[PDB]
Ligand binder design. Structure first.
Ligand code: ZN
Ligand code: ZN
Ligand code: ZN
Length: 178
């Protein structure tokens, strides 16, 4: 197994996957690394199994159809994995915890949103469709762009949104377009 957390790239108290060489901090994995379960398989491995059990699940899909899917166990998992892929980027730090807004010439968003809030919402099964999760994720970046206006820091929102969107298209096998 790797000697650093796959998500945050630090050492520490790591739980090792049995079916791949990745390792995780307990609360870096999503869902949080399960208490017992020998062998244990990480979310990467669980996602690869879904694909292997249903090869056709990789054929292209329309985003509108994906969004309307109910959050059954496989879609729950896919959203957990997509959230984890965002946390994998170090620039996720800016969007992880609860923000506050006091900048001359700007007003804060009407509906603040942050990664840890989305993480709790997933854990608490608060989303009934994929659309709920995706809307909250895109709101994070939209709030950031609106608030920061012409400050160059707006780019951090563009950057992490691009990570989100590329991973969304991959995980949910969105049909490729120009
Ligand atoms: Zn970690
Ligand atoms: Zn694994
Ligand atoms: Zn099949």
């Amino acid at each position: 197994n790797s000697n650093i957390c796959e998500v945050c790239n630090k050492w520490g108290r790591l739980f090792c996957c049995d079916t791949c060489p990745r390792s995780f901090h307990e609360h870096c994995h999503i869902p949080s690394v399960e208490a017992n379960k020998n062998p244990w398989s990480c979310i990467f491995c669980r996602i690869k199994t879904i694909q292997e059990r249903c090869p056709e699940s990789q054929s292209g899909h329309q985003e509108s159809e994906v969004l309307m899917r109910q959050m059954l166990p496989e879609e729950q998992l896919k959203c957990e994995f997509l959230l984890l892929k965002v946390y994998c980027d170090s620039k996720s730090c800016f969007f992880a915890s609860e923000p506050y807004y006091n900048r001359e010439g700007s007003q804060g968003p009407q509906k603040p949103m942050w990664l840890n809030k989305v993480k709790t919402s997933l854990n608490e099964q608060m989303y009934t469709r994929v659309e709920g999760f995706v809307q909250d994720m895109r709101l994070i970046f939209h709030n950031h762009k609106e608030f920061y206006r012409e400050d160059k820091f707006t780019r951090l929102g563009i950057q992490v949104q691009d990570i989100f969107e590329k991973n969304f298209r991959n995980i949910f096998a969105i049909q490729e377009t120009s």
